[PDB]
Each structure stands twice: as C-alpha cells, then as structure tokens.
Write a structure and sequence with these properties.
The complex is a heteropentamer, with 1 copy of chain A, 1 copy of chain B and 3 copies of chain C. By secondary structure, chain A is of the alpha/beta class. Chain A is built from 14 helices and 12 strands. The chains are: A alpha/beta, B alpha/beta, C alpha+beta. Chains in contact: A-B, A-C, B-C, C-D, C-E, D-E. The complex binds taxol, guanosine-5'-triphosphate, phosphoaminophosphonic acid-adenylate ester (2 copies), guanosine-5'-diphosphate and magnesium ion (3 copies). Chain E: It comes from Homo sapiens. Chain E: Belongs to the TRAFAC class myosin-kinesin ATPase superfamily. Kinesin family. Kinesin subfamily.
Chain lengths: 426, 428, 344, 9, 317
C-alpha cells in the first residue's frame, strides 16, 4: 500500500541509490541476503512500501537500475548490498553517453528506454496502490540527465496522476566536473520543470561544506555525500512507512510546499549532524534540531537562503517529541526571521512527526525548503550557457546526435522564465 | 434507550476517539477486550454473551492510524467492519476528501451508520469528531454531513472540530480547507463545538504545569469535555439534559450554532490539595478568559446562551449562588434579548481519572458551553489569512485540479462574510 | 510604429432553456443602454452586451466583421468564447454549420474572408492554410488526423509559440474549409452532462494563416487568425460527473484557472505574467499580450440558478478589457528587396 | 485576386 | 554553356475529299524518314511524318522532351506554320475531350501532371496557366472578353511578356482541361493563340526555386493584308542570314516569342503540307520555311532563382 518505484540513472544515481538501499534495509532490518533480522514489528508493518516479497521470506527491492555503461552496474552488483536487487532489473547498454545529453536522450537512451519502461510497468502492475516514482540522477552528465529526463517524460505520460519526486544532483558553482555541464543542466531542467511534481536539488559543494564544517571530516569521499543524501531521502518518506502523531505523504508535502506549479525545486537538509567527539557535548532537543535545520550552513544546495525569501518549509520530525514544542519552535523561527519568509503566505512551515527515529538516534529531522534563492543556481547555469552558446562551443557533439539550436534556445527561455517567476515572488 | 453514534473522521478525530473510548470503557467498567467483570446502552451494544461493541465508526483515508487502532490495546473492542480505511490520503486537499477520494468509501460509511442506526431504538443524535484544516476532516466530513442530513435530517448532529489556531498552525493550506468546510457544513450541523490546540496548550502549561504537552493530553481533555456533555444520558442526577435540550438552549438563531466548550477544574495532583474546589470557584474559573478552549477573549463580545453541566457532588443551591454571582459581575456581558441565559445540569457521577493521566481525582467538575459573539474575531483572522493567500491565488491549482470550480472559493468567502455580518447584527 | 489596442470583450446572454424554465428560475439580467448589463444592482460595462434575442448575424457583424479585414490587411486576429457549462460558446463560435441563419462565427468568417479575397486587387496572390486541433486532458490532439495523439508547443526566433506537427491543409474554396470543420467536429470529444446534453470537453482551436504576396511591389504580408471554443467551468453538484467526465472536468477547470490567472496578471500589470502554466495559455500568449487584435465573446446565463457563475464570468470579462496589446503589421521582407539591399 | 494551392506529389 | 538547335519537323496530312473529287494527285513522295522529296528537289528536315501517322507518335517524337525540360528548368515552345487547312489545329489541339486524338495540349498537361505526381515528394509546385490570343496586331485576353488591345511591358530581364492577363492557378488535370475548353470556346482562323503555363518548382530542402515556361502557341495562315507573318518571315530571314538589327519589334506576334526565336528557350517547330497537285505554288513556300528555320542556334541556361533566405545570406557577406 502506497508503494514507490525507485529508478537509478547514471553513475551518480546508481551510487547514491546503493547507499539509499543499504540505509533503508538497515532501517527495516533486512540483511544483505534478503532475509529479515529486525527487532520490531513496525519494520515489517510497511515493508511493502519499498520492497516486494518472495518465496522463503526474502524481500526484493522494487528498484530499477539503468545506465548506458555496465561498469557501475557491476560495481553495484559486487557491493555488499548488491545481491538484494533483482537480477532482471539491471537494464544496461554497452555504449555510454559520453557526457552527451543528446546521446543519452535521442540516440542511445531511446534504444534502452523501451526495456526500462517494461521493467517499470511490470513493477508498477505488481503494486497494490501506487503512490509515486523516485529517481536519482545527476544533471551534469550524459546518461543521468538525458536518460532520466526521457524516462520521466515517458512515465509522466503513462501515469499522469502519480507523484514523480526526483533527487537530482545539480552542478556546483565553483568546481565543474565536466566541461559540458551548462548544456546538459539546462536541457535537463527544461523537462524537469514540466514533468515533475517535486525535485530536490543537491550539489556536491554544499555536501563538502557540511562534511568539513559540521561533521569535521578530514577526507570526505563520495560515500559520505551519498550517505547524507540517503538520510534525507529516507526521511522524506518516513510517514509512509512508520506510525506517527501527524502523518504527511508525498502528495501532502507537494500540496503544502508547491504554491505555483513550476516552483517545485527544493533545498533539502538534515539534522542532527555532529562530529564524533562532540556528541557528548550537544543537547538533543527540538530547539537545537530546529536551529540546525534552519541554518544556511546545513542546506545541501549552494544557494544561500538569506539572499532570498522562503515560500514554504516542511519539517518532518522523527522520534518522540511534544507537538507543542515543535509548533512553538516553528512559530518563533518564523517570527524571528520574518524578513526571510513570504508575507502573503501565513504559516510557511509544515510539520510532520513520525514516532520512530533512526537507529541510534533519539531524534531526527528532514528540512525541505522552497526558497526564491534557488534562482541563483539557475541564473549562473544560464550565464554559463549563454557564454558557451554565443560562440557555439562544444555544440557539434550535441547537434551530431540529432538536436537543434532551437531546442537550446527554448531551454534557455524556459530557464529564464523560471528565474523570472522566482524573482517575482521576492 | 437513549443511544448515540460516534463518527471519527481523520487523524485528529480518530485520536480523540481513542481517548474518548478509553474514557468511556473506564467509566462503565468495561475491559478493553469487551468483557465486563446498565447505563452503558448509550455508547455500547450488548452481544449474546459478554462482548460489548461500541457504537463508533472510525473512518480515515489514511490507513496508518486505524491500523494502530487495529493492532493497539483496543483491538478486540471495535467491530472490524466499523474501522474503515482507504488507500491514499486527502493530502490536505478539500477536493480530494470531498469529490475524488471521498466518493469511494462514502457508501461504506453510510451503510455502517445505517446498520448501527437499525440496532438502536431511541437514537438521539450523532457525535461527529473531526478537525478543520485537514483534507479528510474538511472534505469527507462535509460529504458525510450532507448524506446524513439528506437521509436522517430530523435527527440531531453534533460536531467537535479542531479549529485552526491564530498563530500556531501545521498546514499551509489550512485557511482554504477551513473556510470551505465551514461554508459547506454551516447548513447541516446543529451545534458545532470548536476547540483549538493553542488554547489547550496554554491550559496545560498554566494549570497542569506541563511544559511539553502532546496530542495525547489534548485528546484526554477533549474526551473529558465530551464525557461531561454526554454524562446526562448515561447516569442519573438532578436536572438531566438531552442533546435536543442543548440545541434548544444554545442556538438562538438557526445560523448561530458555534459554541465554545470550557472545562473546570483542570488541575494537577500537587494542586489538587491546597484548593477547596468549591462550586463557586469552579464556575468563576470556568468563566475566566484564560480558561477558554478557543483562543478568543469573551470580554470582546456578549454571551448569548450559556449551559452549565455540573458533575459529582453538586447541590443546586450552590449552583444558584454561583450563577447569581456571575450575573452580578460587570466584566461578563450578556446580550439584552436574553434575560435568562443560564441552563444548569447536575449529575451524580464524578469525573473518572484515566491511569497515567495528568488530571487529578476531583469530586465535582463543570463543562461550560457558551454561545458568545467573541468567536467572530477567529472567523475574521481566518478570513484575513484566506484573503491574503487568495489574492495571489496560491495553491488554488491543487484544489481546482481535483474537481473544484474557482468560484467555490469566492462563494465560501461570501458565506463567511455573511456569517460575520450575522454575528455582528445579533450582537447589537 | 506602435498602435496599442485593448481587448474587445463583448457579452452574449442566451435564453432560458427547458431544463431551467420548468424549474422556478427567474431572468435576473437587467439591460440598460447598449453596452452595459446590471446584475444584482451592480453595473458592468463592456463594448457590446447582446440581449437574449440576438441572432447569429448580429453578433457576427458586431464582433467578427472587423477581424476579417484586419487579418487580410496584415494584422493577427483571435476570438475565443468563455463562460460556464451550457452558456453559449459552441453556439456562438460554430453552431449549425450548414444552416444559413443558425451558423456561427467560424463559417461566417471563412465566407467573408473568401469574398474579401475575391474583391481584392488583381496583383495579389493568397495562400490559405487551415489547422484544427484540441486540448484534451492536457494533450494537444489533431482533429484532422487521429495518429497525432499528442503534440508540443515550441517557440520561434522572435519568441512566439506555435503548435508543431499539426496538419496544415491548404484551401481554395469555402467548401473545403467547411469539410475541414465537419471532419474536425466529428472527432471532437463530447459528453452528456446534466447541464448540457452535448457538452464539449475540449478546447478546440481553429487556425487559418493568410499569406499575401503582391507581384508588382513584391511586398508580402502574413496574418494569423485564431478561433478558439473553450470549455466551461463546471461544478460537480450541477454537472453530476462520475468517471471519465470527472477527469475531463478536472482538466478543464485547471486550464480555465490558468487562463484566469494570466488574464489577472495582464490586468494588474504584473511582471512574470504566467503564460507557461498551461498549454492553452501558451498557445494564446501572443493573443492575450502580444501582436494580436483579440476579442473575447463571453457567454452568460440569465438565470438565478447561475448567478455566481455569471458574476465570475462578468468579472473575468471586465478585467480582460483593461489589458493592452501591441499590434504591428507583419511585413515579411521580400527576396527582390533583400537582393537590392545587398547590392546597395 | 487568386488563391494558390501547392501541388505536392 | 550549351547550344541546342531549334528543331524543325515536317508533317503531312491525308488528301482531302475535295481534292480527290477535283482530281488532285499525290505529288510529294516519302524517301527515308529524315526528308521528303517533292518536285524532284530534296528537302532535308529533322523528321518527316507520313500522311497516316498517329498523333501520339508526333507527341512522343516532339513534346515529351519539352515536358521534362519545362519540369526541371527549361523554357519550351512548340508551334505550327503552314497553309490554311494544312492541319495546324489537329496538330496542336486535335480533340479536346476525345481520348483518341488528344493532339498536343491535353496530352501534355496530363503528362506534366503525371510527372508531378511522380518523383520526389519534397517539392512544392505552383503551376499557373494563361491563355490569350492576338489579332490584327491587337493583344486580347481569351479568358475574359473585357480585356482588349493590351500591351507588352519589360520584366527584370530583357524578355517581353504580356502584362495584365489573368493567370489562373490549376491543381488538377480536370481544371486545366476545363480552362482549355473555355478558352477554345471563347474563340470564333486568322488569330494567333498563345498558351503559357508557368510551372514553378521550389525545393524546400535545398531552398532552390526553378521556373519554367512552355509556350504552346499556334500561328495563322501564310497565303501570300497579313503583316505579322511577313515580319515572322523577316525575323527568320534575319536569323537565317545572321544579320543583326533583327526586326523583333515590327509585329506584336514576334514580341512574345522573342526568347523562343533565339533566346534562353529550347523550341521545336512543326510544318504541315499537302500532297495535292493543285497547290504546287503554296506548298513549296512552307517547305523552304522549315529548311531555313533549322539554321538558328540558341543558347539555353537553367532558369534558377535564389529564395528569400538566400538573398539575405548573401547580404551578410
Ligand atoms: C554511539 C552512537 O550513538 O553513534 C552515533 C553517532 O555518533 C553520530 C555522530 C552519527 C554517526 O554518523 C556519522 O558519523 C556519519 C557518517 C557519514 C555520513 C553521515 C553521518 C554514525 O556513524 C551513524 C549512526 O547512525 C545510525 O545508526 C542511523 O540509523 C543512520 N544509519 C546510517 O546512516 C547507516 C550507516 C552505516 C550502515 C547503515 C546505515 C540512519 C540515519 C537516517 C536514516 C537511516 C539510517 C549513529 C547514530 C552513530 C554512528 C555509528 C557513529 C551521526 O549520523 C547519523 C546518520 O546518525 C553523525 O551525526 C549523527 C549523530 C550521531 O550521534
Ligand atoms: N487535538 C488534536 N489535533 C490534531 C491531532 N492530529 C492532528 N490534529 C490537527 O489537525 C490538523 C491536521 O489535520 P488531520 O486531522 O491530521 O488531517 P486528516 O483529517 O487526517 O486529513 P488527511 O491526513 O490529509 O487525509 C492540524 O490542525 C492538527 O493540529 C490530534 O491527534 N489531536
Ligand atoms: N443564442 C442561443 N439561442 C438559442 N439556443 C441557444 C443559444 N445559445 C445556446 N443555445 C442552446 O444551448 C445548447 C448549447 O449549449 P452550447 O451553446 O452548445 O453550450 P456550450 O457553451 O458549447 N457548453 P460547453 O461546451 O460545456 O462550454 C444548444 O443546444 C443551443 O441550442
Ligand atoms: N493528320 C491529320 N489527320 C486527319 N485530319 C487532319 C490531319 N491534319 C489535318 N486534318 C484535318 O484537315 C483540316 C485542317 O485542319 P486545321 O488543323 O483545322 O487546319 P489549319 O492548318 O489549322 N487551318 P487554318 O487555321 O485555317 O490556317 C481539318 O479539317 C482537320 O481536321
Ligand atoms: N555523490 C556522487 N556524485 C557523483 C558520483 N559519480 C558522479 N558524480 C557526480 O555526477 C556528475 C557527473 O555525472 P555522471 O552521473 O557521472 O554522468 P552519467 O553517468 O552520464 O549520468 C558530476 O558532478 C560528478 O561529481 C557518485 O558516485 N557519487
Ligand atoms: Mg491523515
Ligand atoms: Mg461546447
Ligand atoms: Mg487552323
């Protein structure tokens, strides 16, 4: 009941989804072989949300792993939680996109999207009451951006009345991993804006900042960043899986947090986030959790919320806590930061409390923020796109796979319109 | 026999219902399994041997909380067909609760009510428990009230809603849902008792001296209020009061049926001693603005009708003295067209204390249900929030996209302006 | 080079119907003057308020007669009807296609455009192309080809949106246009509702492009004419929709709310002006805030059973009348003049 | 004036 | 470039019943297929048709090349010169609505429509017809009797053309057939009929437009007051002798076929003669006409124009 189909597209999506599934299985007491070794019945009460059943009390996740190269699929299979997945769900080609959005959306992704949609359709049909779709990808690459966008469009045209929440990794401002990030990101957002219900924007720069500042990690690796992302991915849908005093589904979050249809780009966050050797000094309470949540340092997007105003905020608390404490803390946060909140919306914050915390934590929280500050990311992406596109730089690679300059202009216009809409409500 | 049906819609309704049914089972000496080791026919049904089946219908589109009821300590108390669940929630959408997702279990709940209504000889009314603001507790309750009014109509209908608070709030689309539901259900309910979480939080902080009140405590307080309301049916006493008496003594005009409940004494065990808790003190503290369960000062308005439901060791002479002292006081303001705005009800059953509860064992308690014009300011602030959100037309696409014309918002706003105007007119 | 024009919003009141005259309903509309209507003692001023007895010829003459001349002169024109369920949009726009007295705006426009073409200067050569599609469940369907189940709205060099892939049929005689209209109407989606027995569940769009070339002066002009028949706002209590009709109603209401939002944005002088929230608002972007001379024919019911909807439609028409358009002649540069400019 | 229809095979 | 000869073909009709009643004999004799011998004097032509030859034969031998060349880029012209009642209506028009005859014009329009139906689909064709005739050096529109005594202006290139005549677009072979029938009905034969179709082939992919004009014209009698034929005999005498200062402007008949006579247009000429013996004098005059007409050589270039986008691009450089 209220099942979620999970899709991993590209290297970033796959290596984040693997951490996500390890985290979820640990939370629900599933050992890597697929057996159940938990301690509480609430783990099995709603195991149908993220898992299917099989003969022998073995639980298989309903995850669909897609890529245009088999290397990352082999890495996932060879991992510690790799044999939990269904061997039929691995759908892959043999020619990668090569960080070409056109290659992954028009030429190589088209040949694989049929089989991917077949697996998606089978998994959805096996579900009792489908709730939504979950996608992990990166906007800065070829297979992720392009293939995930094509799959999102196809699924949206196939299931128009279902939530499509995508956890995308946006290009970082200061350091660029690929030289064609602006093109891929603009072309991916041009379809994310139209074919998604709520997209969560994560950039590696904010993750590195969190790790070095709050977590005090000397050598942050991709595992730690994927782990921080998996924390908020699990925390977003905790009310679907465990009982709580005040429950909020994905659609409830979308209704509260999306005032206008095209403004569905969110900044996620997590709390508590302390360093070993500093937990004995902290005080785990709702005020401290809220102070951590609303801090600009704790955001996982490189868009400072101070340079903007919040439209809607969601606070999905976990554990045993007073509703009075939570509501008073939210009210005082809104009052003390009135300049950072929108005035034509009373009570910008939404609250959901789940009465089951993550293992080893007495309390936890996930912060979802719809801020006008996300326009800065789009503005810099559009600036880089214009700089690269006035001079036709790196453009024959995209044109050689069947794209046109008019598509680039339309994507840029859509990005500019989204920026203008965000600026209007500020 | 005098029998009532309880309907709990949405998460708030079902939580309050869990508290209320724990309280009732404690009052009547029924173990949670349904085995008693009269005066229970109002809320319970007797089977061939032992098992007492409560007259409740738990309805929610979310299956989670009804599943908690199904697996909780009160598992073998309710008839499993009474507990009704959906698949997907209303997601804080009035349209989902009313038009789209509501019209998939409405036939089931109506059939269950009819089956319960066929097992009662002297049906008296409905005790619908829901919450303003939520999608289910605003959309599904409106559809259910329409169906019940069309089907039964002559039978009474009482509501115990959770009104949105001024400052403390949870949802962001709460004003829309609240105005839509109180536009739709203004013509169907006969007496809608309203409470808000913020006033109960303040009551818990000051009187009960608990700095971290949660939903369980609020549900217990509301359960005590509803037990005080319905105690006249269950137990004996001097000046017993029925639900039709509530309607005929609390509703002056057909469009003015929004009283606010108040309870006294709400004290801890430490302060249970050191206090006399006399009838006069209880009544005076019950008329205090800080003890109101709705965030509105009654001093900014005039009382129309006020019914007092005393419990426990209460003598009518004490009640008369307390009423005289209240009437002589100048701060309380009664309207001109009501020379006598006091109805008194005395009962011999003292309030019961749930084990592991904040309330203390007291010999007497009161429940003040007053129809005052001070509730107009709550409507005013809710309408202000609605107007602010609707000027920019925010969140409207979610409601419009599930079977709701854009003009329904304007119609609801006009109806609310009319209700505010009616309250102002009756004030003068 | 700029000649600003407003929206020529005009109101049409249909007579009370059988289902409404036999159930205790009263004619609430009171008409004063020739351009204003009084409802609930609240004046509303429009360009022309047509009363219950107005024939199709009169509304066509006072609404769409100028649009043919404007299109053939070089400007862009667009007319779209608005209202609630069972209000008079299909009757005003198309009506009975083959009846000389009951035909609507579209057949009269096409006949007049052909007659004006015949009465033009001899040196002109005209190319006319007809497109006819609909918006059903947020999908652009071609009513002339069922294979095009859904289409897309792209943009041009000068940032104007247009439907891509729609069948463009060249025409020579009004008979061909009438056959196109008939074939399109056969495939348009209709449903049975309590308010209207032949209710339309799609936003039909009729497009004709008139390309005009002069042989002597080589000067070339183009004109785009949109004729849209929108669906009406519905209420589940009145319509009683269950099943597919409910989904159609949901999509129709969402699209109409988007259109109302864009009209309010134009009227208030906002900056974002949300054209991109729906397909219909995208297609009519240049119509509402660009290079088009647009007239809105709002249709209303005069009964007390539909007073709230009539007031909402009246407010929509009043707000639209204030918004302004920037209209210029579409003079496409010529090849001979291009080569002359190159040489000189 | 005249109206032209392209003859596309 | 390329130099192509103005073809000349000789056609013979069967002896008439009046001639066999009057006792006329068969003087002309056929020798081979590329000449005809009469009066013991060989006359060399490109091709000589027998008396009983079929009209499909002459169409296949003469006109099909004109059809394909006008379809691609090449202006064409075919006309008949001969004595009265020698057969220059059946040669050109024949039977308008009898499938057996379909002399030249109906067959050529059907063939051009078939060829249009064939070949690449990515091509836009705008074909325009315009039928007009002249009489006594007065140009008169044939599709509308209102127009009378028109004139000839000058286009961008040095090519005189009729100005003001109605040019009706046609889309189907039935339309061309009915417009030809109406034009012939509007004719009451000393008049010169000029039939022009302007097939304009525009390619969307290459943005290249090619305009072709075929002239299916018919002459008047040559019994020799007639003046246009005298200048027609003067212009060919200018062309055959090669003398400059050619009198193209002497008569208005030659002012329309100026590119057909020596310009950017590949043309063929047919002559009709009679084997009768009573008309020995007038028969030799038409025979010598075809021999001299072969002496002309014309230069043809593909009529190619650049689209509006192409001129814009050349301005950028
Ligand atoms: C002795 C003790 O209490 O140890 C704690 C601990 O010290 C702290 C510092 C933990 C620790 O976390 C980290 O150091 C960390 C490393 C990489 C990325 C993110 C965090 C901990 O490792 C993490 C671990 O978290 C869990 O057990 C949660 O269930 C968590 N699990 C995982 O992330 C996970 C890790 C490996 C394998 C499988 C799952 C979780 C959180 C949300 C949703 C699902 C699961 C906890 C409480 C601790 C340690 C062990 C030191 C903290 O993290 C979490 C996620 O709880 C860091 O700040 C918190 C506060 C904790 O007190
Ligand atoms: N007193 C009390 N109020 C509650 C409780 N739970 C939620 N509320 C209030 O109810 C409102 C939220 O509505 P809910 O009843 O949870 O929503 P719902 O009716 O279940 O509708 P959906 O969940 O959207 O299907 C908020 O104002 C909460 O403060 C509760 O247990 N007790
Ligand atoms: N001016 C009019 N005179 C007479 N009958 C009319 C007139 N306008 C509408 N009607 C009648 O009303 C019915 C049509 O409703 P119509 O006018 O078709 O509604 P509509 O606007 O197309 N409804 P909808 O598609 O839901 O927006 C027809 O059968 C008409 O005969
Ligand atoms: N090849 C032929 N076969 C049969 N009949 C023919 C042939 N050629 C000509 N005729 C007939 O002979 C006559 C001459 O025809 P026509 O073609 O009318 O002559 P013309 O040379 O056009 N005369 P004119 O226009 O007066 O200078 C007509 O009756 C024709 O039908
Ligand atoms: N957190 C994380 N980020 C990654 C990982 N792999 C790649 N990225 C980021 O993703 C972007 C590159 O896109 P990628 O997914 O590799 O291209 P694709 O395989 O064509 O989709 C860059 O910004 C990388 O830093 C990973 O394993 N973990
Ligand atoms: Mg709920
Ligand atoms: Mg219609
Ligand atoms: Mg002749």
């Amino acid at each position: 009941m209220r099942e979620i189909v999970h899709i991993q597209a590209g290297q970033c999506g796959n290596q984040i989804g693997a951490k996500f599934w390890e985290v979820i299985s640990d939370e629900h007491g599933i050992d890597p072989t697929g057996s159940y070794h938990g301690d509480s019945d609430l783990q099995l009460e709603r195991i149908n949300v993220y898992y299917n059943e099989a003969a022998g009390n073995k639980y298989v996740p309903r995850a669909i792993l897609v890529d245009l190269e088999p290397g990352t699929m082999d890495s996932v299979r060879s991992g510690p939680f790799g044999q939990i997945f269904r061997p039929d769900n691995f759908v892959f080609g043999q020619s990668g996109a090569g960080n070409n959005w056109a290659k992954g959306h028009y030429t190589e992704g088209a040949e694989l999207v049929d089989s991917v949609l077949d697996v998606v359709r089978k998994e959805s049909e096996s579900c009792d009451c489908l709730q939504g779709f979950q996608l992990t990808h990166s906007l800065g690459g070829g297979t992720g951006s392009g293939m995930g966008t094509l799959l999102i469009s196809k699924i949206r045209e196939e299931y128009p009345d279902r939530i499509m929440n995508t956890f995308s990794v946006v290009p970082s401002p200061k350091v660029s991993d690929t030289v064609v990030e602006p093109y891929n990101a603009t072309l991916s957002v041009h379809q994310l804006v139209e074919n998604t219900d709520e997209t969560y924007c994560i950039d590696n720069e904010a993750l590195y900042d969190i790790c070095f500042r709050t977590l005090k990690l000397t050598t942050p690796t991709y595992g730690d960043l994927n782990h921080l992302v998996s924390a908020t991915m699990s925390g977003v849908t905790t009310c679907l899986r465990f009982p709580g005093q005040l429950n909020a589904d994905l659609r409830k979050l979308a209704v509260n947090m999306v005032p206008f249809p095209r403004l569905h780009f969110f900044m996620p966050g997590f709390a508590p986030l302390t360093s070993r050797g500093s937990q004995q000094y902290r005080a785990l309470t709702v005020p401290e959790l809220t102070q951590q949540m609303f801090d600009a340092k704790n955001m996982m997007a490189a868009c400072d919320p101070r340079h903007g105003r919040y439209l809607t905020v969601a606070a999905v608390f976990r554990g045993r806590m007073s509703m009075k404490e939570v509501d008073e803390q939210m009210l005082n946060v809104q009052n003390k930061n009135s300049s950072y909140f929108v005035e034509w919306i009373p009570n910008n914050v939404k609250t959901a409390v789940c009465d089951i915390p993550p293992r080893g934590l007495k309390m936890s929280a996930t912060f979802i923020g719809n801020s006008t500050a996300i326009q800065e990311l789009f503005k810099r992406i559009s600036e880089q796109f214009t700089a690269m596109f006035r001079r036709k730089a790196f453009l024959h690679w995209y044109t050689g796979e069947g794209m046109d300059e008019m598509e680039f202009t339309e994507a840029e216009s859509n990005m500019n319109d989204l920026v203008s809409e965000y600026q209007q409500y500020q | 026999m005098r029998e009532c049906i309880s309907i709990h819609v949405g998460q708030a309704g079902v939580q309050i219902g869990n508290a209320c049914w724990e309280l009732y089972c404690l009052e009547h000496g029924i173990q949670p399994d349904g085995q008693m080791p009269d005066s229970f026919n109002t809320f319970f049904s007797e089977t061939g041997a032992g098992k007492h089946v409560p007259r409740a219908v738990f309805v929610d589109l979310e299956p989670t909380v009804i599943d908690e009821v199904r697996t909780g300590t009160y598992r073998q108390l309710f008839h499993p067909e009474q507990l009704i669940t959906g698949k997907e929630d209303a997601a804080n959408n009035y349209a989902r609760g009313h038009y789209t997702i509501g019209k998939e279990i409405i036939d089931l709940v109506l059939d269950r009510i009819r089956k319960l209504a066929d097992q009662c000889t002297g049906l008296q009314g409905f005790l619908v428990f829901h919450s303003f603001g939520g999608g289910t507790g605003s959309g599904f309750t409106s559809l259910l009230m329409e169906r019940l009014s069309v089907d039964y109509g002559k039978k009474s209908k009482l509501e115990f809603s959770i009104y949105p608070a001024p400052q403390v709030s949870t949802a962001v689309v709460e004003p829309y849902n609240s105005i839509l539901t109180t536009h739709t259900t203004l013509e169907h309910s006969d007496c809608a008792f309203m409470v808000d979480n913020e006033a109960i939080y303040d009551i818990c902080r000051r009187n009960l001296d608990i700095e971290r009140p949660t939903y369980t405590n609020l549900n217990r307080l509301i359960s005590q209020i509803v037990s005080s309301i319905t105690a006249s049916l269950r137990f004996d006493g001097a000046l017993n009061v029925d639900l039709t008496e509530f309607q005929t003594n609390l509703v002056p005009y057909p469009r003015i049926h929004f009283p606010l409940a108040t309870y006294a004494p709400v004290i801890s065990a430490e302060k249970a001693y050191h206090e006399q808790l006399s009838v006069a003190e209880i009544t005076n503290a019950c008329f205090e603005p800080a003890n109101q369960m709705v965030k509105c000062d009654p001093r900014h308005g005039k009382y129309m009708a006020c019914c007092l439901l005393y419990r426990g060791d209460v003598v009518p002479k004490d009640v008369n003295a307390a009423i005289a002292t209240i009437k002589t006081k100048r701060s309380i303001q009664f309207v001109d067209w009501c020379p006598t705005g006091f109805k008194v009800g005395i009962n011999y059953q003292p309030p019961t204390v749930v084990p592991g509860g904040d309330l203390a064992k007291v010999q007497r308690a009161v429940c003040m249900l007053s129809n005052t014009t001070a509730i107009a300011e709550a409507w005013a602030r809710l309408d202000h929030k609605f107007d602010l959100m609707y000027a920019k037309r925010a969140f409207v696409h979610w409601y419009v996209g599930e079977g709701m014309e854009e003009g329904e918002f304007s119609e609801a706003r006009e109806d609310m302006a009319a209700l505010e105007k009616d309250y102002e007119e009756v004030g003068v | 080079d700029l000649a600003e024009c407003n929206i020529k919003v005009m109101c049409r009141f249909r007579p009370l119907n059988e289902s409404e005259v036999n159930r205790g309903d009263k004619y609430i509309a009171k008409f004063q003057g020739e351009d204003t209507v009084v409802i609930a003692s609240k004046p509303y001023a429009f360009d022309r308020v047509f009363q219950s007895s107005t024939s199709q010829e009169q509304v066509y003459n006072d609404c769409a007669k100028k649009i043919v001349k404007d299109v053939l002169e070089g400007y862009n024109g667009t007319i779209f009807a608005y209202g609630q369920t069972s209000s008079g949009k299909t009757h005003t726009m198309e009506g009975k296609l083959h009846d000389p007295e009951g035909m609507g705006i579209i057949p009269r426009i096409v006949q007049d455009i052909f007659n004006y073409i015949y009465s033009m200067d001899e040196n002109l050569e005209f190319h006319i192309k007809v497109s006819y599609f609909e918006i059903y469940l947020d999908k652009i369907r071609d009513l002339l080809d069922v294979s095009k189940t859904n289409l897309s709205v792209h943009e041009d060099k000068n940032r104007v949106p247009y439907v891509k892939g729609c069948t463009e049929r060249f025409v020579c005689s009004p008979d061909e246009v009438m056959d196109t209209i008939d074939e399109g109407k056969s495939n348009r989606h209709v449903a049975v509702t309590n308010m209207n027995e032949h209710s339309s569940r799609s936003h039909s769009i009729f497009l004709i492009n008139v390309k005009q070339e002069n042989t002597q002066t080589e000067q070339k002009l183009s004109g785009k004419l949109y004729l849209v028949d929108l669906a009406g706002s519905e209420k589940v209590s009145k319509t009683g929709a269950e099943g597919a009709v409910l989904d159609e109603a949901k999509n129709i209401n969402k699209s109409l709310s988007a259109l109302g939002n864009v009209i309010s944005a134009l009227a208030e002088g906002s900056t974002y002006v949300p054209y991109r929230d729906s397909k219909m608002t995208r297609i009519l972007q240049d119509s509402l805030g660009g290079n088009c001379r647009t007239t809105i024919v709002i249709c209303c019911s005069p009964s007390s059973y539909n007073e709230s909807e009539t007031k909402s439609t009246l407010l929509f028409g009043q707000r639209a009348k204030t918004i302004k358009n920037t209209v210029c002649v579409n003079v496409e540069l010529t090849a001979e003049q291009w080569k002359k400019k190159y040489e000189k």
